[PDB]
Amino acid sequence: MRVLLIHSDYIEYEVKDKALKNPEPISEDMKRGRMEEVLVAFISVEKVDEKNPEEVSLKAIEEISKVAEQVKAENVFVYPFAHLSSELAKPSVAMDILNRVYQGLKERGFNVGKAPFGYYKAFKISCKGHPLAELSRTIVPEE
Amino acid sequence: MRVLLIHSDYIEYEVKDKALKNPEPISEDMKRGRMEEVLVAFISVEKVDEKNPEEVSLKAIEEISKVAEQVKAENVFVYPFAHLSSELAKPSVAMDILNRVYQGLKERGFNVGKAPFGYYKAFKISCKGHPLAELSRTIVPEE
């Protein structure tokens, strides 16, 4: 797993055309959203993560949480993003891990938002300038 | 080299604290900028690119140009971005290749902007939703 963490003034998106044949089923409220003063977590699920979806997820939960605490962010947004890696995971496994992370973050007490997996999306973001406002992390299972 | 191409309604940035001891020397006009209807090229210069800075640059020039033509973009923005890879190039080589690409793009007739290398930057962007508005490419020298 490769994650890009951006402390942002805001994030906003709108679902467009499907990017996959079997994308993530979404409700009407899911095709658009916005959060402010939020840690946006752009996530790229990799092939190696298929070795242990749960381990990778718990580790990602921990890392993202740790950074949210550092920048004092109460909001987190899970943004499916495949461009952080070329060694991508099977779509079904990517969705499962993205859900595990999303769910784990809410169980930790954060207000968490997310964008659907499998669709092209227009989106806007504003990255603060601070040293810790734009970080990347590599999380993998101990093989 | 790893590149993330985003067709955007606009890009805007403001230089903040130095992220390196010897960042890129910048003028007053260089610490902030904005472009609209622009292909933003987030670029991560890798260690392997040190084998042939020129070859990698020409290839990147070609790929970026080819996508700008596809989305019918007249503006291109070179955005130093190290999070697309973990195998990063020496800062001096990264700067040289980022300059070669920037210069090559202008020689092709595009209006090209860029952000300084080596500083933390607040930035805002709006990615269109179109299928070709968010692409990534891996460019490496034939070893």
B18 CB neighbours in chain A (<8 A) are none
User: Which CATH code is given to the segment(s) A1-139?
Assistant: 3.50.80.10
What are the φ and ψ backbone dihedral angles of B24, each rounded to 5 degrees? -80, 125
Tokens of B91: 């800062």
B136 CB neighbours in chain A (<8 A) are 82-83
Query: What is d(CA A111, CA A40) in angstroms, rounded to the nearest whole number?
Result: 12
Query: What is d(CA B33, CA B112) in angstroms, rounded to the nearest whole number?
Result: 12
Tokens of A78: 């899970």
Q: Is the dihedral of CA B114, B51, B120, B30 positive or negative?
A: negative
Interchain contact B124–A (C-beta under 8 A): yes
**Do the Cβ atoms of A122 and B126 come within 8 Å?**
yes
Experimental determination technique: X-ray
How far from B31 is each of B38, B63, B114, B130, CA to CA, in Å? 19, 27, 10, 30
Interface with B, mutate which of A8, A36, A120, A137 (most B CBs under 10 A): A120
Domains of chain A, residue spans: 1-139
